[PDB]
Design a binder for these strands. Structure first.
Ligand code: MG
Ligand code: MG
Lengths: 290, 296
DNA sequence: GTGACATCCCG
DNA sequence: ACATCCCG
C-alpha cells in the first residue's frame, strides 16, 4: 500500500539533528534559523585560550545553501547576529567556538538585548558551573501571538534579507543543572522566555520564567525527553539565585574582559561610579606591566 | 562528546513522517497543522462505497494531545476544517477516508475557498485520473510574508482556539502525474499556491502557479527528492488543460447533487429556478434525475 | 469524548 | 565593498 505512496519519496523537512564539537541543533529551513540549540557547560569548558575576535560569521557548510541564511541578510538590517550557544561556552575548543558562528546557530536579535540582558543570562549559565558540575542549556527563537483590539490572536513577525530570515518576537532558554554525577540531590530546571528587545537591569530573570509545559506548548517541542518528570526535579530559582549581574557587577566584569584585549578602560570605568575590585586591580597590573 | 550532550536526549520536534493507509504527512506541533501531506490517486481509489457523512473530524490519535488541534478550536472560529488529503480521493476505502478527517490532515480554511475554488482543484486532481494512470499530490499550508510600504517584510497569520491552531494565508499543492506504468512520456509536474481567501471563477489555475524551486524556498521543503531534476519533466499545464470547472459546469454539478438530498418540491423546484435564474442550460442527464425525482 | 445514526442548512 | 575603526 505504501510502496506506491512512497515511490518518489517524501518531502524533506531538514529537521534531523546535527551535532557539532560542543552543541547540537535542529534547523528551520523555512525560517532560516534554529528550532532549538542544545549545549553542555562545565568548569573546564569555559576555560581556555579561544578568542571570539578570531572567529567569523558564515553559513553552515552542512546546510543546503537553498535554505541557508547569509551575512548579507543580517548586515544593515538593523538586527544583530545572536548565537544561541555562546562562543564564551567554548573557551576550551577554538573549533567548537568556530562552529557556534555558523549561521545555523544564529538568529536576528536586538543589539542591546544580545549584548545586554540576554548576554547576562549566558553569564548566569557559566556561573552555574561554579556550583554545579554539569549544566545543559537549550535555546531557540519564538514567534508568539499577540491578542489585540478585536481579541484576535495574531502571530506577526518580520523577515529580513533576500532569504527572509525570521526575526523572533521572544527568545527562550531551558537550563538543566545537575549538582554532580554522584549526588542524590534532584535536578535543577527552569524555563525562561525573553522578548527580543532592549531590557534593562530592573527586571529580574525570575519574571521572565515560564513553566516547562507551557514553553513546550508554545515552542511545540519536548525538552529533555529522557528526563523522568514524575521523578524529583527542583526549581533552579529556588535552589539557586536566578540573579543576573547588576549594572555595577556587569560593568565591572566587562572591564575585566577588556583589559586582556587600556588607559581608556579605567577612565570610563570610574566615570560610571565603579570601584575597581582587587580581582580587577590584580588583572590590571599584570596586563599593565606586560 | 555527543554522549554528554545527549545524556537526556535532544528536544523532539515531532516532524517525523507519519504514514496512513492512503496518505502521509509531517505534523507541526507548534502550529497545530501538517507541514506537508502526500496522497496518491488512481482510477479505482476514487470509486467505492465510502461516504463522507459516516465520518467526523477528531484529533489524530497518534499525536500527543499537548500538540494536537481540537474541534473546539475550530467551531465558532469563523474558519472551516479544510482537509489536505481529500475524502473524495479515498472513496474506495472505508478507513482511508476516515483517516483524512484526523485534525492532523486539516488546516483552518476559508469556508468559501474550501468548498469553492480549492474544491475545483481537488476535482481537477481527480479529473487527471482519466488522462493519467497515477497522480501524486502534495498539499499543505503556508504563511507567506507581505511587504509594507516602508519596506519591512512581515509574516502575519492568525491563531485560533485554546490550543492556538495557525491559520495559513495560502495553501499549496504540488501535482505529479505519470501517464501509465506502461508508457514512457516524461512526467508532468506543477506547483500551485492559492490564497486562503474566497476566489471567484474568473481566475484560472495557471495564475496561481509558481515554480517548484520557488515553492520549495518559501515552504522550506524539498518535494519528491528521488525525482531527478535533470530528467525530462513536463509542465503539467502544457501537457494537460489545467482547466477547472467554470461556473456553469460547477453550478450544474452541485444542483445535480442537491436534488437527491433535498426532501420537498419547493427545494427541487427552486434548484432549477437557480439555473435559469443564473442563466444555465440544464442538460439531458439532469432532466432525468429531475423528472424522476419529480414523480416522487 | 466519540462511534453511529438519524435531521437540517449552504456553496 | 573592504579595511579600519567603534559600539553595549
Ligand atoms: Mg549573542
Ligand atoms: Mg476541503
Amino acid at each position: 500500500e505504501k510502496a506506491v505512496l512512497e515511490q518518489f519519496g517524501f518531502p524533506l523537512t531538514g529537521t534531523e539533528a546535527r551535532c557539532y564539537t560542543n552543541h547540537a541543533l535542529s534547523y528551520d529551513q523555512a525560517k532560516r534559523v534554529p528550532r532549538w540549540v542544545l549545549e553542555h557547560i562545565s568548569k573546564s569548558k569555559i576555560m581556555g585560550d579561544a578568542d571570539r575576535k578570531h572567529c567569523k560569521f558564515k553559513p553552515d557548510p552542512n546546510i543546503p545553501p537553498t535554505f541557508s541564511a547569509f551575512n548579507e541578510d543580517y548586515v544593515g538590517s538593523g538586527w544583530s547576529r545572536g548565537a544561541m550557544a555562546p562562543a564564551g561556552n567554548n573557551k576550551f575548543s577554538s573549533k567548537a567556538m568556530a562552529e557556534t558562528f555558523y549561521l545555523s546557530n544564529i538568529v536576528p536579535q536586538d543589539f542591546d538585548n544580545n549584548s545586554g540582558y540576554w548576554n547576562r543570562i549566558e553569564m548566569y549559565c557559566r556561573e552555574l558551573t561554579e556550583r554545579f558540575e554539569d549544566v545543559w542549556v537549550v535555546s531557540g527563537p519564538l514567534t508568539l501571538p499577540q491578542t489585540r483590539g478585536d481579541g484576535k490572536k495574531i502571530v506577526s513577525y518580520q523577515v529580513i534579507g533576500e532569504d527572509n530570515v525570521a526575526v523572533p518576537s521572544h527568545l527562550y532558554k531551558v537550563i538543566l543543572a545537575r549538582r554532580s554525577s554522584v549526588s542524590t540531590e534532584p535536578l535543577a530546571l527552569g524555563a525562561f522566555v525573553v522578548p527580543n528587545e532592549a531590557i534593562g537591569f530592573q527586571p529580574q530573570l525570575t519574571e521572565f520564567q515560564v513553566s516547562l509545559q507551557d514553553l513546550e506548548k508554545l515552542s511545540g517541542l519536548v525538552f529533555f525527553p529522557h528526563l523522568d518528570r514524575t521523578s524529583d526535579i527542583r526549581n533552579i530559582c529556588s535552589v539557586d539565585t536566578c540573579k543576573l549581574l547588576d549594572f555595577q557587577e556587569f560593568t565591572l566584569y566587562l572591564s575585566t574582559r577588556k583589559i586582556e584585549g587600556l588607559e581608556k578602560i579605567m577612565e570610563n570605568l570610574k566615570n560610571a561610579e565603579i570601584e575597581p575590585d582587587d580581582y580587577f586591580m590584580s588583572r590590571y597590573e599584570k596586563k599593565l606591566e606586560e
